[PDB]
Amino acid sequence: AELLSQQWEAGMSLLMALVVLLIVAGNVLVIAAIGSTQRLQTLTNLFITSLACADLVVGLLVVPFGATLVVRGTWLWGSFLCELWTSLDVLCVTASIETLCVIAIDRYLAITSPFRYQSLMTRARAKVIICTVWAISALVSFLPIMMHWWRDEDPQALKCYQDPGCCDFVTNRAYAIASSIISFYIPLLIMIFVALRVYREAKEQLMREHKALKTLGIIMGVFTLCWLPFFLVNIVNVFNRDLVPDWLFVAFNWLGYANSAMNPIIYCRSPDFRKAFKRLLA
Ligand SMILES: CC(C)(Cc1c[nH]c2ccccc12)NC[C@H](O)COc1ccccc1C#N
């Protein structure tokens, strides 16, 4: 049994270290590629940078802390770090779906109203948009957690709050529903609605302007596939606590984490990223 534990720890630790490396390496490349290639320095890629930072924070902070919990079965970092960790987790997935939502609107307005778009949409303004996305994401994610709005009345929950080794996100039903709707479900619907409109307006309307759009359609689709299972379960868990097994919930949350390693791979469809990747890996 002690050998089974010693194998499981060292085994998992490496899988986790591989995941961390794939996320951090992949996204640092994307930030560097854009940051040092003036062919890639478009307004749209400013939003891709923002998105890569969100995925970077997942790789440097969210998954590391999450790994120590999955390896060692308990939280080792004190109740304050548990809260700050959870806040960063919630923050990143919120900022990601909001930025993807901006990207869809960006592409739409650029397609349907190209004269008015290109005369209004500036670098200064894309930065303002990006900050506003992060400001809103911070507001919706950080505050309710620090205010303990998520916490429930149950004695078993109360037991977990006092124990600085418990870092389970046992949330009340109101928070579970509200935070899911505000952080995920609303921006997801807006994104899908706008993305379908773009897909329609693309056919009605030029190889390089397209294909890049398809790429953006992929990242949005993949994100949805990685996160929808988690948020669906999260809502089901409110109506009946026992239907979904613990492992399936934890697994789906890890699928969502995994999404942070996927974009840099998907960007390799764009040859200019591919060339910038090859140059940087000197
Ligand atoms: C914080 C938690 C539950 C990870 C976690 C932390 N401790 C746990 C113990 C057992 C299972 C999972 C966990 N997962 C957060 C997910 O990344 C998604 O988080 C969210 C993002 C926006 C709105 C609501 C949620 C939630 N819940």
Numbering used by the authors: 33 to 237, 282 to 358
Authors' text:
The β1-adrenoceptor (β1AR) is the site of action of beta blockers used in the treatment of cardiac-related illnesses. The avian β1AR was modified to allow crystallization by the removal of flexible regions at the N terminus, C terminus, and in cytoplasmic loop 3, and the introduction of 8 point mutations (see Experimental Procedures), to give the construct β1AR44-m23. Six of the point mutations result in thermostabilization of β1AR (Serrano-Vega et al., 2008), which allows crystallization in short-chain detergents (Warne et al., 2008).
With the human β1AR, bucindolol has been found to act as a partial agonist of the G protein-signaling pathway as well as an agonist of the mitogen-activated protein kinase (MAPK) pathway through a G protein-independent mechanism (Galandrin et al., 2008). Comparison of the structures of β1AR bound to bucindolol and carvedilol with the previously determined structures shows that the rotamer configuration of Ser2155.46 allows the formation of an interhelical hydrogen bond with H3, as seen in the structures with bound partial agonists, but not with bound full agonists where Ser2155.46 forms a hydrogen bond directly to the ligand. Both the bucindolol and carvedilol bound structures also do not exhibit the contraction of the binding pocket observed in the structures with full and partial agonists bound.
